Amino acid sequence: AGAQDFVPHTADLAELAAAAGECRGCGLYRDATQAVFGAGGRSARIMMIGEQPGDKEDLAGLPFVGPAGRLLDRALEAADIDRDALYVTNAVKHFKFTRAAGGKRRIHKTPSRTEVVACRPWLIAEMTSVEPDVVVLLGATAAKALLGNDFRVTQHRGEVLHVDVPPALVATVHPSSLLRGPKEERESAFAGLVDDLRVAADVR
Ligand SMILES: O=c1cc[nH]c(=O)[nH]1
Numbered sequence: 001a002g003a004q005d006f007v008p009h010t011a012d013l014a015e016l017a018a019a020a021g022e023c024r025g026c027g028l029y030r031d032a033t034q035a036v037f038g039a040g041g042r043s044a045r046i047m048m049i050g051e052q053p054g055d056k057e058d059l060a061g062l063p064f065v066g067p068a069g070r071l072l073d074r075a076l077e078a079a080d081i082d083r084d085a086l087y088v089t090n091a092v093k094h095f096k097f098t099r100a101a102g103g104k105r106r107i108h109k110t111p112s113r114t115e116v117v118a119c120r121p122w123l124i125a126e127m128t129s130v131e132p133d134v135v136v137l138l139g140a141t142a143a144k145a146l147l148g149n150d151f152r153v154t155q156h157r158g159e160v161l162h163v164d165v166p167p168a169l170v171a172t173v174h175p176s177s178l179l180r181g182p183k184e185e186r187e188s189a190f191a192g193l194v195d196d197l198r199v200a201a202d203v204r
């Protein structure tokens with residue numbers, strides 16, 4: 001059942017976010033600082049879902065505030081999308097992490113499929129609350145959360161997908177993947193992210 005017993009019967013995002021702070025649906029609440037719920041309002045037509053809060057998000061209490069978020073902001077601006085009009089969240093609400101010796105940050109670790117399924121009732125509550133017209137799935141974990149554990153983001157770029165989810169679905173690269181690598185490859189990947197955001201914004 002995972003998080004289900006912890007989700008209150010409400011669509012108020014402030015009430016949902018407070019309840020997520022008390023969630024024990026998987027083990028991730030133990031070491032994380034706090035739950036990081038989605039940000040934005042229930043009028044949003046576009047919802048965007050990443051993997052999990054990272055190091056910066058875990059302490060800010062807000063999603064996509066670190067380097068990946070700054071790259072995402074650049075892509076949203078190039079796509080003529082106002083971040084303030086979106087509802088932005090993550091498939092898992094507590095940061096899963098470790099530290100390396102001499103390291104500069106806490107390093108995120110990939111949620112297991114078990115943790116994703118455990119936390120998914122929060123995503124369902126968010127989608128019920130917001131009623132988005134389109135959901136942008138940023139990266140493998142988020143895409144698989146709605147499209148199945150076998151789903152390959154790399155094989156469905158640019159496609160409007162739909163499964164029977166309380167919207168059109170658009171699965172794209174995670175912004176963190178665009179931070180590193182040879183410059184020409186990063187630039188081609190950035191253009192593809194802008195394209196996918198534009199596909200989402202053009203739905204209906
Ligand atoms: O909110 C965030 C920040 C970094 N990476 C994610 O998937 N989500």
Ligand code: SF4
Nearest residue numbers: 023025026093094119
């Ligand atoms: S990651 Fe999700 S299911 Fe796990 S304890 Fe946190 S809010 Fe609950």
